[PDB]
Each structure stands twice: as structure tokens, then as C-alpha cells.
A paper describes a structure:
Here, SAXS contrast data from an oligomeric protein and a protein–RNA complex are presented in the presence of iohexol and Gd-HPDO3A, two electron-rich molecules that are used in biomedical imaging and that belong to the families of iodinated and lanthanide-based complexes, respectively. For this, we applied two electron-rich medical contrast media, iohexol and Gd-HPDO3A, in SAXS experiments on a hexameric protein and a protein–RNA complex: protease 1 from Pyrococcus horikoshii and the aIF2:GDPNP:methionylated initiator tRNA complex from Saccharolobus solfataricus. Concentrated solutions of both media readily attained electron densities of 0.44 e− Å−3, equivalent to the upper range of typical protein densities.
Importantly, the experimental CMP (0.438 e− Å−3) was well within the range predicted from the protein sequence (0.420–0.443 e− Å−3) and the linearity of I(0)1/2 indicates that the oligomeric state of P1 was preserved at all Gd-HPDO3A concentrations. Altogether, the P1 data suggest that Gd-HPDO3A molecules are inert towards this protein and their presence (at up to molar concentrations) does not alter either the conformation of individual monomers or the overall oligomeric state and does not generate any appreciable solvation effects or specific interactions with the protein surface. The CMP thus determined (0.411 e− Å−3) was significantly lower than the range of values expected from the protein sequence (0.420–0.443 e− Å−3). Together, our data suggest that while preserving the oligomeric state of P1, iohexol preferentially interacts with the protein hexamer and/or changes the solvent properties close to its surface. In order to probe whether the specific binding of iohexol molecules can improve the quality of the SAXS fits, we generated P1 models with a single iohexol molecule bound in two distinct, opposite locations: either outside or inside the hexameric ring. P1 structures with an iohexol molecule modeled inside the ring improved the CRYSOL fit significantly, in particular in the shoulder region between 0.1 and 0.15 Å−1 (92 mM iohexol data), while the model with an iohexol molecule placed outside the ring decreased the quality of the fit. In parallel, the average electron density of the P1 hydration shell decreases by 10–20% with respect to the bulk at the highest (618 mM) iohexol concentrations.
Residue numbers in the entry:
A (entry chain E), B (entry chain F), C (entry chain A), D (entry chain D), E (entry chain B), F (entry chain C): 1 to 166
The structure:
């Protein structure tokens, strides 16, 4: 499996680094996509290398999608290509894992109406206004969409996501 | 005029400090409400004194409302009392100034359907999903609601808001 | 009216940003002059664009002068061109607004003997030794010179300065 | 299984948080021991709750040991009780995972002579002088001792460690 | 000899720590005086213990005076007692070492007219307005007054000061 | 005398700056060597200019060696040229001053077996495993090697080291 991450500067550090390594443990290949080649830096100062830009991403070449939180989703969701990647992969039924502010990208992709999931509670109302049946739970599994709220949910988040890739 | 601010830790410093002094210049009384008495600190390290808590606010003794941005609105909008203050003052047609993430509180108050305004572009889709006719402009005036996007808009934001007050 | 700001890195953030937007509100054009083109960053991390260098400034093309505080004035006052700009505009009777450490530039310009004003209390003795009648007040108006002490004075500072610009 | 963490302020954040959640996913109980009850903060500013003090640890009540790195090991290795915990658990053949500066605690326990492992390259000379056959590899498995070097090794580090706990 | 330091929070770290240790090498006793007991923290984050408060200082019980720079002198020079200490010791001819912003305290003590010395170049004009013959030199010795400009001058500053205490 | 400093980014600021100026006071010439030309920045944010790279150092052109602490030694000790410089100067019996983590470089040079000295207590066991008779004292003098533990020891450290360069 090839796993794509859509992220940018000001990502929540552990919400990117934890699924990155957890999926590598399984032997999946993990790819970080962002605006520009080079490095990006998290809220807490961890730097990670960008593997490819949004413009170079063909969503048909990836099997699953991870959306870390932080402040990066509010910039990534203004990128028509990045939102388009999320829309197609989510629409095709490929596994999509979101945590915290991550699902702001899915809101912008227009794919969440009638779906069930969670997010950082601070944006629950925006999830609800997008048509999500929002629940306060450490992990929600709604078909291909695995969603969690905060870094304390990491263990449950990837426990469920890893099952979807098996 | 008595002007109420709803804010918290991690407010955007100049988005609070600028209207605070701009409205003081006009002779209005300005009040900072937050979760707890004491002080709150902005994203950039400015400290501000809290005048009263959300719980102690009677919205009928205030004439106008200011909603600065930063990360504070995502905390403030989870406080039922703070959201009701904004809902009541806005629905009564009292002047309400919002900037950046400030209008997340108005989203949560359920008052934006059919209204016209702007915000930090990063949350445009959330404004639109709440029923806002979202405009990309340095300042928008929709009756009692004066909205702006980013600190570069400060001059235009209060230029319009000061007109609504007396 | 064209309003010039003389400043540099380590400016006190709100002492620059507040009058910048307050005077823009009136429709005045505002210009930031510093050592180099590019950007400068305040004590608290706000960045602002430099419009022109001290060397490119013709003081005859500007109508008023604003001197924000911070650590920048102790650097600007060593620049002979910057001090000559302040000397020429102040002695010509053009409106000059200073706050906090701002008037260190006026001290070095040699224009303060016999004047009345205020500053950050920490440099009260240096103002006095320059011949200033130093007053502990939120704003002082001495002809063309409007002076204040600290960020808490911003509202009164620009309230008085805006009057001088009509 | 009950898994014990020995750590303190200035731990390398992901080197604690990653194995913490990875082992929770398996259903193991994880416990953070440090000098004082309360919270500890990592190099990058993440806060974690301390479950018990070194004084309260009975090593017979735990099945495995994790030693995150950062600057914390250099303080922990001066604590006679913490070093004793590591000495007893490692010598008993219980699974011990160390990464980066973590094995400085094992150096101080005097248990590494004749063993094979890795560490932050910066302390390879100290590992070698303690009697370690030092290997430059993302993960080494030497009986009960699973060692890795840097955050980039996290996926391999816990891949091998979880096998030992089954 | 007993050497007294007058300083406070935001002292320039090496301008305090360097003479502190340099004079300890000679066998002198060194005392840190500030506003309150406890610790004070320099601009760069070093902490030092306060030995006594300004109120408790009897100037006749100390043989020499050191005035480090930073932002502490602008606060110390507003304390009538601290300024009184400096006034008495300097006017009595006891050795006084100042660097950077340090001499702002001597300016406020009113003892510098007719004297020869240096300072951080940024306050040169304030020194001159206090009546100082200001010299751009790494160290100046004017009787009991040993003055320097910046941290790069430290070696010369204490080279001259230790001679005065022999 | 020409004194060489081996250091890098994240040096303990006062552990470099203090001996730098103390030895300049004696009239010695002081040289900062690091990985690259330009500047390096200490843990506390002090900036110092690099005089030459490790690659350009001819150890025969220097009379004495200073090894400040911080986190720089853990990177410096991985550079074969830097370690060879310390090994050769120490082996020639030239004066070598180390403090805190400084002696990690000497550990890596393999020159400490049978020698007597001290270090940051946190690496006591690594010094002992390198063959050092470790002493808990503010300064130790073992022939050409003058060693100390922490910034609090600075006065005694250079008190003893300066004697070796007379």
C-alpha cells in the first residue's frame, strides 16, 4: 500500500509523525505531499522532508490518505489541487484517516454530508454544518473514514486505520 | 457606549489591542470578558487584563460586541454562555465587529444564515456552510455586522465599526 | 497627508501597528522607513514591510512623523540620516508623534531643549538632561510634538495626533 | 503486560509519545515514572502526566521497560533508584527498549558489558567504553534488549519491541 | 574587597556573569543586589540568586560597585534607593565598573558631569547630555570609574577594573 | 600564546565566552574553530564568529586548547579532524581546559585512561568508563589538563588554567 499525507507547515507534530512510523511498521510506503519540495516544520518544531508537491500527486497512484491536524489544514484546504486529491480518494472509497483539524480538508472537499465521524471539538460546529453526524469519541470508523480528535487518541486512531489497510 | 470583547488566551494580539484603543479614543468604555478573571496572553505575548467572566456578563448592559481572532475563538465557541452572549447581542441588532477567526463564535451562535461578511480565508468554507454569503474584502458591512479578514485590514475594520457606534 | 515612520528591527509592535492603521483610517498615506529595504520584525514577532530606506527619504516630501518605541530608537539614533530627517521635520513645525523610547531620536536630533513632553519613564532622566520639561501623563501636546509613554497610552496618543493632521 | 517508562523533563517528545501509544494499541498498560508527581515537558514542549515516582516503583510489578531519550537520561542516570530499576529489570531478562540517549541509564546500571546494541551516534564512544558492541543500525535486537538511534528509527524500534511482548 | 552589583531582571547575562566570576577569581566577595530576594533572569535566560535587596544595602559596607547592562538599568535607575547607593559609592571615590547601559544608573545619580567614559554607543547622546566626555573605546579609566561599551569589551573592562581593587 | 577553541552550535554560552575574554585579558590570542565559517549560536542565543574550520586547523600552530560544554561536544566528537586536534594537543602535553560536556571530545580522542579530572556529573559514568579518576570538585588540575563541571565553577576553572599559560 502507498499512503499519502496532505500537510504543510504548522502541522501538529505527533499527528503526522505517529501514523507515518506506525504505517511504515506494517511495510506500507508513506509519502508526504505539501505545497513545495523541501522541508516543513510542525507546531512544535519537528521538521520533515516533503516527498512531492500537490501538483505532482496523481491520486490514482495512492491507496490511502492521512490528514494530520494542526494549523496546516486551514492552509491546505485553500489549495484546489490538494482538496481535489482528498475529494477523489475519499469519493473512491479509499481508506482516509483524519485527526483534529485534519477533516477541514474533507469539509472543503464536499464529501462529508451524511457521514459520521469526529474532529477537534473546537470545530465540531463546522463539521455539523458540513452535514457530519458528529460524535465525541476517541475514534470513529464510518466505512472508509477513520476519524479521531486529539493526540491522546493516537493509539486508537491507528489501531482502527491499520485494520482498514489489511 | 459600552463595548464588550469576548476572547481568551491565544487571541491575535493586535486584533484585540487595536479596537480596544480605537474605541477608547472615541470615549466608549471597553470591557474584556473571558473564562476567568485575571490576565490572558495573546499569540505574540501581549498580556491583557480580564474585566469579567462570561458567566457574569449581562448582555443587556452592553451596546456593542467585538470578536478578535487568533486561536481563542475555537475555545470561546465551546462555551455556551459566551456563544449565547454573541447570539443575543447580534440578533438584537447591536453592532458586532468580527475579524479573522472571530466569526467562529457567530457560526456557533447560529446567527449567520443569510448574512454577508468575511473572515480569515482559511475558514471561508465554514462561514459559507453556516449560510454566509462570503466576500473576499478588507471590510464588509452587513447592517450591524462589520467583518474583516486579517491584521492588514485593521484600519478599514474599525473605520466602518466606529460609524455604527455613538 | 503623507506620514513617515522611522523605525527598525526590535520596534515595539503595537506602537508601530496602531498609529499605522489609525492614520490609514483617516485616509493619510503611511510610509515605513528603515535601514534596508525588505522587512523588519518587532519585539513580539510581527513583521512589517519597509517602504524606503533612510537614505532615500526626502523630508520635504512628508507632512508628519511618527516615532514608535522599542529597542529600535537606540539603533535609529546612531544613523545620521535618520536623525537629520527627524531634526528637519520637527524643527520645521511638522506634526511629530513619539511614544516610549521613540523620543531618543529627538534627543539625538538636538531639538528638545525647552519643550514639554513625556516618554517611557525609564528614560525620563535622559529627556530631562536634553532640556525637556518631563511630565508623567498618558499624552502631552506641545505644539507640533505629541508624546506618550507606554502601549496603554495608545488611545490618547493618536486621539491627540489625529487632531494635528486636521 | 505492564510497561514502565523511566523519563523526566526534556525527554525527546516523540521517543516517549510514539512507544506510549504504540503499546497502548496492543492493549498493554503503560506507566510513566519520573522524579515527582505532576507533569513533565519534552524538548519540543509536549506535556505528559507522571503516573508514579521512582521511589514508588516496585520493578517486580512491571513486565517491560522503555527508555526514551532526550536530555532526560543524563538526569535519570544520577538517580540511584531509577538506575536500580533499570538494572533489575534488564538483568532479569525483561524486555527493555532504548532509543538515542536512553541507554545512558543502562550504562549507569552497569549491565551493558558484552551486549550488542546502538544509540545516538553522539554517545557511541560511551557505549563502546561501557562494553557494548556498537552497531550503526536502525534497530538492534540482543535478547531482551531492543535498541535504536534516532526518531527516524521509531517504526523499526517498536516493530521489534512489540514482538518481544507477545 | 566586597563588590556590590546593582542589577535586576533583563540584565545582559554575560555582563553580570563575567565580572562576577572574574572578581571571585581574585578572592573578592561578590554580592548581587536587586529589588526583591529570590532569583533574577537575564535577557538570555541565565538565572542568578539575589543576595540582598536595595533597601538592605548599606553602601559603607561595600568596597566597589559593578553596573552590568541590559534592560535592568532603566528599571534600577527609577529606584531612589538603588540610585542613592551608586551616588554615594561613586562620589566617595570607590571603584565603579560600568558597561553598556550600566551607566544609566550613574546618569540618574547625577555624578557624571566633567567625567570621562563610555557606554553602549546607543546612549552616547544621553551620556553627553549628562556632561560626560564620551570616548569610543573598549575601556576607559577615569579615576575610580572604569567604563566599557559592549560584551566584546569584557576582557579589557575587567583587566582594568581588577587593577583598581589591588 | 595562541589558544584554540573547539566548539559548534549549542555550546554553553558562558562556558565559551568566559574563557574567551579571560584569556584575552592575559594578552593571549584566541581562535574559535568549528565545522564551518560564519557564526555559531549558543544554547542561550549568544552568537560568536568562527575563525577557522576544523579542516584548516594545524594543531602545531596553537599552544593551548579550550573545550566548552553544551550540546556542541556531542557533535564535535563525531568529527575525526576535530577529535584528532584534541588528541594531538592533549598528547603533546599542551594545556587543555575542559568544562561540563567538553571532555566528551577527550573521551573520543582516547587520551583519558589513567587521568584525573571532572565533568558534568551527568556524564560521570562515561568519564569513569573512559578510565578517568573522576572527582566531584569545582576544578581539577592533572598536569596539562584543567577540568571543571558547571558554569558555577568558571572562576576556579580559569584561575587554574591561566597559571599553565604563564
Amino acid at each position: 500500500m502507498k499512503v499519502l499525507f496532505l500537510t504543510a507547515n504548522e502541522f501538529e507534530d505527533v499527528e503526522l509523525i505517529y501514523p507515518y512510523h506506525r504505517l511504515k511498521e506494517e511495510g506500507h510506503e508513506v509519502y508526504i505531499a505539501s505545497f513545495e519540495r523541501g522541508t516543513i516544520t510542525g507546531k512544535h518544531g519537528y521538521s520533515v522532508k516533503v516527498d512531492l508537491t500537490f501538483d505532482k500527486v496523481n491520486p490514482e497512484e495512492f491507496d490511502a490518505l492521512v490528514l494530520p491536524g494542526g494549523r496546516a489544514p486551514e492552509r491546505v484546504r485553500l489549495n484546489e489541487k490538494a482538496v481535489s486529491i482528498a475529494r477523489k480518494m475519499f469519493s473512491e472509497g479509499k481508506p482516509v484517516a483524519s485527526i483534529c483539524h485534519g477533516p477541514q480538508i474533507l469539509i472543503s472537499a464536499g464529501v462529508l454530508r451524511g457521514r459520521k465521524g469526529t474532529s477537534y471539538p473546537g470545530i465540531k460546529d463546522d463539521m455539523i454544518n458540513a452535514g457530519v453526524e458528529w460524535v465525541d469519541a476517541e475514534v470513529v470508523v464510518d466505512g472508509n473514514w477513520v476519524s479521531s480528535r486529539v493526540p491522546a487518541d493516537l493509539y486508537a486512531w491507528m489501531r482502527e486505520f491499520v485494520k482498514l489497510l489489511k
